[PDB]
């Protein structure tokens, strides 16, 4: 009656994990190696298809994490190494007019540096931040060392390599496809009844930050609360805003870049001095916009924790500076901003905010071992305007009051940041070969 | 294998259609150990793509394949003697570069898939 | 080429069997210059393996291929209207994942090799 008929080109797929390649329109993320993008990339809507999606088991996040770390190492490899800088520093307090906010944050350190000739040395002086300098001994000898000299080698970032994130697209190789959930109220996990296939993901900027998601995607209609297990306080809650909150971060100090020849063709870039006054770096956010955004976040959290539960926001309970502050890179400078005024509110069911920011010039990105980076100073004054598009929050566990929930900023694992952009994308492999009964028999 | 390659490039299309195996056999084979490997991989993909075309058409395994697509005088009004006896393949490819994808679509869509479905239905009579 | 890809994924198997060329044409195309190359190589192998299956079966060069393997109701008791008119290929592949390798073995072993040997013996009459 019925006979096996073989079909090739069947629109069937399986869950898969593969190596997705790159498409992009002197950069950290290479960009030359990454394939050029194609205009008007095709998007095809799959009608009558419901596909399960898990953001919390998406291998695109792990691949992006590995790729960004590897690209960072590759960018750092050919740049000037600053191993000679591990010498005794003689540091005094800056003698210019310094605001109380900054009195003791910046030190003027003198040291004996090498030159292009191995038999000569030079006496030089550089300005260093207090979060990059360690007292050599407890006694008041005024002799100090760089923070990394005991644990890690330090490499200077190439001044010609910009730290501005640029959008990148992750593309499937032939035989694989990227499925995009188009549901606008998608909680991250579960069936998606509105699916499309794409050649590549949208433009994702690999912005590195903690506690606030910057320059990301916005929720289409409502604030989205996504968590792998909302009952598990060990997992982070990703909040995606439906409206951005504008944050204006500045390093007010006018800055100079002093070039010191430390080898035959190696230059070290020191801060040198500040023209004009010395003022603390800081970020401004609108008070009303932030307050309405927090009201919306609370409204969405009550859908998981109860209509009558008190929602409290408080500052980070602990961790390193990268996770107790809002850390980010803008303008080439690394800011560590105190968000204690962003999360300082109790919400019962019934102007601008200025965040002080500290600067470091010695950065250990991620948590690698034995490798640090010196960030060269940027000349001039840095002014930065960014969109806050989401939060990474942790719920306080072990509560002794069941009528109140407390949420604190978290971060430090960038897979939670890049999972906030890749949450809607899934990689599948195509199974074009299939069999089915028909009435056709081979002669 | 290389010997005789592209020898009939300047010959007429009729004369140059009897040497198809000579061109067919020449399509298939420290950063310099990677780039050369990429070139080898590239060659394979090109070969497979052409073979894939021949398979989506009813031309798999053939060097000369007859089809059910009628020729359109818009594509070319030249006689057969002015194509096969008085013309080379390079000149023909230069004229018909403009129309290649219409012929390829007609080859792909109407004739092969309708023929394949008609064999699917004749085989169950 | 990409346009229309997987569009009939949610369509019925009958409707989705007329777009086989759209999926077929989308199967073929500094450590990042090696990993991407590996991906390209991987795609080729997958394509060739599927083509190899089609060649060990009597299905080389075809997108729709009729065979001499009888369907077994153990594999599926559904009618033709409940497979081709009221069902998608993803649902069918989920049910028949369990039986795929039995059908593949029957396709490989009995029918094609016995047919090929019978043509070997008919050709010498």
């Amino acid at each position: 009656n019925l006979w096996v008929t073989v079909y090739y080109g069947v629109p069937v797929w399986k869950d898969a994990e593969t190596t997705l390649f790159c498409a992009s329109d002197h950069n950290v993320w290479a960009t030359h190696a990454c394939v050029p993008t194609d205009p008007n990339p095709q998007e095809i809507h799959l009608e009558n298809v419901t596909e399960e999606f898990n953001m919390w088991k998406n291998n695109m996040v792990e691949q992006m994490h590995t790729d960004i770390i590897s690209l960072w190492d590759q960018s750092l490899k050919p740049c000037v190494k600053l191993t000679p800088l591990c010498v005794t520093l003689q540091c005094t307090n800056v003698t210019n007019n310094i605001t109380d906010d900054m009195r003791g944050e910046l030190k003027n350190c003198s040291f004996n540096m090498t030159t292009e000739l191995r038999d000569k040395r030079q006496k030089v002086h550089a300005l260093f931040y207090k979060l990059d300098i360690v007292p050599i001994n407890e006694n008041q000898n005024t002799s100090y060392r760089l923070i990394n000299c005991n644990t890690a080698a330090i490499t200077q970032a190439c001044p010609k390599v910009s730290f501005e994130p640029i959008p990148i697209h992750y593309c499937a190789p032939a035989g694989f496809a990227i499925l995009k959930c188009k549901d606008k109220k998608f909680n991250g996990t579960g069936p998606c009844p509105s699916v499309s296939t794409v050649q590549c993901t949208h433009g994702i900027k690999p912005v590195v930050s903690t506690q606030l998601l910057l320059n990301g995607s916005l929720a289409e209609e409502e604030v989205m609360i996504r968590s792998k297990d909302i009952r598990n306080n060990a997992k982070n809650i990703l909040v995606q805003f439906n409206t951005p909150v504008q944050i204006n971060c500045t390093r007010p100090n006018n800055n100079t870049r002093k070039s010191i020849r430390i080898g035959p063709g190696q230059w070290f870039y020191a801060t040198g001095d500040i023209i004009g006054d010395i003022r603390q770096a800081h970020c401004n956010v609108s008070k009303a916009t932030w307050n309405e955004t927090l009201g919306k976040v609370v409204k969405q959290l009550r859908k998981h924790f109860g209509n009558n539960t008190i929602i409290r926001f408080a500052n980070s309970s602990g961790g390193d500076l990268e996770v107790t502050t809002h850390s980010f890179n803008c303008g080439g400078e690394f800011f560590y901003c105190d968000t204690s005024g962003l999360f300082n509110s109790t919400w019962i069911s019934n102007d601008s905010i200025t965040l002080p920011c500290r600067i470091k010039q010695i950065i250990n990105m991620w948590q690698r071992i034995g490798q640090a980076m010196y960030a060269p100073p940027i000349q001039g004054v840095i002014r930065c305007v960014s969109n806050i598009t989401g939060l990474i929050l942790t719920r306080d566990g072990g509560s002794t009051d069941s009528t109140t929930e407390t949420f604190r900023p978290s971060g430090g694992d960038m897979r939670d940041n890049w999972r906030s952009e890749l949450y809607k994308y899934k990689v599948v492999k195509i199974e074009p070969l299939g069999v089915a009964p028909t009435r056709c028999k081979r002669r | 294998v290389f010997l005789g390659f592209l020898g009939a490039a300047g010959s007429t299309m009729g004369a140059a259609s009897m040497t198809l195996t000579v061109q067919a056999r020449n399509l298939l084979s420290t950063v310099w150990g990677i780039k050369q490997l990429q070139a080898r991989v590239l060659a394979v993909e090109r070969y497979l793509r052409d073979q894939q075309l021949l398979g989506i058409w009813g031309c798999s395994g053939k060097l000369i394949c007859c089809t059910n697509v009628p020729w359109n005088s818009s594509w070319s009004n030249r006689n057969l003697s002015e194509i096969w006896d008085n013309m080379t393949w390079l000149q023909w490819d230069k004229e018909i570069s403009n129309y290649t994808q219409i012929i390829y679509g007609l080859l792909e869509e109407s004739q092969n898939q309708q023929e394949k479905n008609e064999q699917d239905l004749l085989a169950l009579d | 080429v990409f346009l229309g890809f997987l569009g009939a994924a949610g369509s019925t198997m009958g409707a989705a069997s007329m777009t086989l060329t759209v999926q077929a044409r989308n199967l073929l195309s500094t450590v990042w210059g090696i990993k991407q190359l590996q991906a390209r190589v991987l795609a080729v192998e997958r394509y060739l393996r599927d083509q190899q299956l089609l060649g060990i079966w009597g299905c080389s060069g075809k997108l729709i291929c009729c065979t001499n393997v009888p369907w077994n109701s153990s594999w599926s008791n559904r009618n033709l209207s409940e497979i081709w008119d009221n069902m998608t290929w993803l649902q069918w592949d989920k049910e028949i994942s369990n039986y795929t390798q039995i059908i593949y073995g029957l396709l490989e072993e009995s029918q094609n090799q016995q047919e090929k040997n019978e043509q070997d013996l008919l050709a010498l009459d």
Partner: nanobody
Amino acid sequence: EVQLVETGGGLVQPGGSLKLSCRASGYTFSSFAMSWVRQAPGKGLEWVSLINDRGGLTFYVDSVKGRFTISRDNSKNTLSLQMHSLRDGDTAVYYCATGGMSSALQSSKYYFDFWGQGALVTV
């Protein structure tokens, strides 16, 4: 509901070139194969021609194989039969009918399910 309505039937001379057209309604025309079957005034039924659901496969009896031409248009829902070189043996009531074959993806329809009013042809 299935309503088949033939037209184009009348009278012609030997060697005539007569075109009939059967209009269908009440069902999906493109989903069914169609046939033409004829009945002489004093004899029984005789099958004449068969066309598949897509209009690409046509079958005829030997007696009319080189003279008759079955065709279909699935947008207009119209089946048609063009007979050339009509012979005295072709005098009959011609009926259009649904069925006679089906594609590999459907169940067998080796029968004529629905029928038309009929159309007299006198050669």
